[PDB]
Amino acid sequence: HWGYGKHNGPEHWHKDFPIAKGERQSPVDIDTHTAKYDPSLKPLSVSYDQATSLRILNNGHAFNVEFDDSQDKAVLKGGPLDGTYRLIQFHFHWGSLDGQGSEHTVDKKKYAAELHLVHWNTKYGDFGKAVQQPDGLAVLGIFLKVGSAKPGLQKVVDVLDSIKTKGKSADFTNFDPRGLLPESLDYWTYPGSLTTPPLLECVTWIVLKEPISVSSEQVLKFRKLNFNGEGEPEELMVDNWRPAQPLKNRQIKASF
């Protein structure tokens, strides 16, 4: 099945998922001099105070911190969005080295990693229905660079030991995602897709301009995770990022 290696990676995905070569694929390069400020954008509203995390899972591609979305608690609204989008999970994409790891790029610059906070449109009742809609998902993307530690990331870092291999999960309650956010909510936005198979074109991307800093020791622990399952040969979970895809005349709008 699909992965990030030479024989199952992003170059191969189109065979099982033809939409890989579609009209609104993600990620993309954000060309800052082509992106236009949009006065019609309303302020972005990220309300994570009432968020309820349940557990963390190694799914053999990345790790997901999953949230209880059976009530309107952690919500993303405003900006380019119409209505209310509920937080369901977050995960990261990262590299084997600090010079790569992000999926979106900024004037071709690759960051050390990228956080995706995934939200579904409440008008569609549940996540599975939303991913069948052009405006079913909103993903908040945040770049990570290596420098000072991110205190609010440490609880995640410390639990990775318990989920080394594919299929492992651990209880992960009372994690506050507010501690992963940069100061500024300045962002670029474009219509796109999931960056993993099934690559569905259901996402409004909201990519923050300001990166968060994480320590070298924090990212190093990300790189200790395994793609493989328990008792299998060790395949380090690194470079789990899809490269930039063709923009195809889409317009990236800036909030600033």
- For ligand 3BS, the closer CB: 35 or 202: 202
- For Hg ion, the closer CB: 200 or 212: 200
Q: Within positions 65 to 104, which residues make up the interface with ligand 3BS, using CB under 6 A?
A: 89
Helix (H) or strand (E) holding 118: strand 113-121
25 scored as a contact of ligand 3BS (CB under 6 A): no
Task: Please provide the DSSP assignment of 209-255 as one string.
Answer: SSPEEE-HHHHHHHTT-BSSBTTSPP-B-----PPP---TT---EE-
What is the C-alpha separation between 226 and 222, in angstroms, rounded?
A: 9
Site string for Zn ion, 75-114 (x = CB under 5 A): ----------------------------------------
Is 14 noted as a catalytic residue in this protein?
no
Which residue has tokens 């492992």? Answer: 168
Catalytic residue among 12, 14, 33, 61: 61
| Residue 202 interface partner, choices ligand 3BS, Hg ion, Zn ion, none, CB cut-off 5-8 Å depending on type | Hg ion
3 state SS of 19: helix
Would the annotation count 104 as a binding residue? no
Shortest Å, Cβ 32 to ligand 3BS: 22
How many residues form the binding site for ligand 3BS (CB under 6 A)? 11
Instruction: Show binding-site residues for substrate.
Output: 195-196
Catalytic positions are 61
Instruction: Show binding-site residues.
Output: 91, 93, 116, 195-196
Residues at the interface with ligand 3BS (CB under 6 A): 89, 116, 118, 127-128, 131, 139, 194-196, 198
